[PDB]
Each structure stands twice: as structure tokens, then as C-alpha cells.
Amino acid sequence: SDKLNEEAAKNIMVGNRCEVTVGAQMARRGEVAYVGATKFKEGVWVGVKYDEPVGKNDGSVAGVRYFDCDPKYGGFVRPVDVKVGDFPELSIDEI
């Protein structure tokens, strides 16, 4: 319903790397797997495939599959909580 979510969504594209910050939560990075309307709630939703199992779903909500990923690796959030861009996975193999 927000204009803000409408704005923030303008440039969000499936395939984009991103960083999700919902509320108090610690920033989490992943890849945009879905952008747009869904069946569970009105407005725009961004489905994200997380780098770690820090999500709430496996790409499906209420039995409707929106995208694919392993359990706990997917999440749906409002566009205003998503920053898209060069957000590489936070990992250090050796330093």
C-alpha cells in the first residue's frame, strides 16, 4: 500500500544481490528471487534467497511456491527493507 515500497521496488530486480535489514534484526545478504504481489498479503513483496539459513521459508508460503530454495533460506520482506547492489557473501576462507 505504501508509496515508499513502490519506490524502493522500482529498481529491485530478480537476480540482484542484496542486503535485508528488517527491523532490529542483523543485516542479512542473499539474492533477490522474487519481486511483486503475492497471495498472503497485498502490496509488493521481495522474496530473498539468503546466503545462510537465516530465513523463514523454502520459497513457499501457505503452500504456494514463489521461488526455490532450501528450507530456512528464503524470506519475504517489504521493498523498503531491501538494499540491492554489490553485496557479496560475507565469508572469509582464509586471511
What is the amino acid identity at position 26?
M
Which residue ranges form the domains of the chain, and what is each CATH number?
Answer: 1-95 (2.30.30.190)
Q: Are 85 and 25 in contact (CB under 8 A)?
A: no
Long-range contacts at 8-14 (CB < 8 A, ≥ 24 apart): 8/78, 8/79, 8/80, 8/82, 9/35, 9/44, 9/46, 9/79, 11/84, 12/46, 12/79, 12/82, 12/84, 13/84
For this PDB entry, the determination method is X-ray
Q: Which residues pair with 48 in a beta bridge?
A: 32, 75
Note the resolution in Å, 1 decimal. Answer: 1.8
Is residue 37 within 8 A of residue 44, CB to CB? The reply is: yes
CA distance linking residue 17 with residue 90, whole number of Å: 12
Using CA of residue 25, residue 13, residue 17, residue 48, what is the dihedral sign?
A: positive
Please classify residue 41 by burial: count the beta carbons closer than 10 Å to its beta carbon, then call 0-12 exposed, 13-18 middle and 19+ buried: exposed
Cα angle vertex 63, ends 44, 61, to 5°? 35
